[PDB]
């Protein structure tokens with residue numbers, strides 16, 4: 428909330444990963460965990476750990492005087508620029524004008540710099556070098572609102588973007604930061620246009636509205652252990668993993684699917700004795716999206732898919748990727764959904780081919796999945812979902828590139844296997860098709876020989 432307390436100060440200095448965890452556990456026991464303090468601490472520790480070193484053990488000591496001085500600089504900067512007397516607060520709500528003033532104060536403070544660099548996500552970066560990445564700006568606006576006592580201002584998050592909410596139940600929204608490269612500044616606006624256009628970017632309104640403890644979870648997920656393109660900090664990974672289990676135990680990941688996926692990935696990296704296994708945690712992320720977000724999130728199934736892929740469970744990887752396409756078909760592809768376009772592209776035209784290549788190799792060298800018609804049915808459901816996604820969307824999704832791998836992947840199954848799935852137009856396995864194009868090739872897909880140039884054109888059509 429506002430001002431460092433003795434209950435926080437008595438836990439300094441922070442001389443270890445566990446000391447940091449202890450400070451977070453103390454803060455998470457309060458109604459208003461201090462976002463500024465916790466972000467400064469994480470940014471300080473990350474800044475000094477994210478470098479290659481000589482020396483088996485190392486931890487950069489967070490002395491209270493350094494943290495307290497940075498904290499005072501931020502608080503003075505915010506309190507001195509925002510006259511609360513000019514903004515009558517009627518009923519515990521913040522006015523859209525007040526929220527835009529705080530946002531501009533942050534915004535006008537920033538440095539020219541490469542806004543997609545690592546380790547500029549925390550308030551440490553903001554205070555010491557006036558640099559923030561995209562979502563770091565949104566987080567900084569929420570921290571500054573907490574520093575002013577605006578208890579209703581909170582972080583909102585989609586799977587690819589951040590803004591703020593405020594007013595009763597977070598009814599009000601405001602853009603505070605940029606998104607992508609080149610798009611027109613929407614700061615100050617609501618997000619209703621993006622919700623209304625059914626873009627993935629705004630999740631049809633099924634986006635996350637954080638309380639203060641989920642904002643803590645956000646800044647933990649935002650830790651970046653990357654030192655260079657080949658190296659991660661093991662200390663930062665351990666710190667993030669321990670903090671996520673703390674958040675998990677207190678219930679603050681219940682509505683945070685991406686944090687549960689992150690935690691499962693970290694457990695796959697390095698299992699914690701006595702904890703649920705990664706698969707359990709991936710399914711909890713999916714359960715969370717189904718329960719709180721109308722099953723309208725993509726990454727819960729991508730997380731699961733990646734894990735199955737790494738472990739060479741080809742059927743379950745394919746089934747998870749089909750699930751991602753079943754979710755995406757109900758969106759319209761819009762002018763800033765590119766990041767999810769890229770993910771589906773690499774899955775269709777890179778990962779799935781190589782998985783299938785390896786499974787071919789494996790059979791060419793002596794019960795494959797290419798012999799499982801269920802896997803072929805999953806492959807069809809995946810492509811059916813992407814076709815319907817493109818329907819009713821201006822940007823052309825499929826094209827000649829997608830065409831060659833599609834037919835290459837179909838060939839990876841012999842006719843006798845393929846002929847065992849009954850394909851049903853929407854209006855062995857039994858599979859219903861939802862898209863125009865895949866309804867079209869209904870019988871080509873199961874012929875003893877594959878009509879290449881046919882399938883190639885029916886997909887790239889229109």
Ligand SMILES: N#C/C(=C\c1ccc2c[nH]nc2c1)C(=O)NCCN1CCOCC1
Pocket residue numbers: 562584585586587588589685688726729730733770
């Ligand atoms: N990229 C990526 C991400 C996850 C992911 C997870 C599993 C996957 C499997 N294959 N690709 C995968 C990708 C991701 O979460 N980043 C964006 C997070 N937002 C949050 C709001 O603020 C802006 C940033």
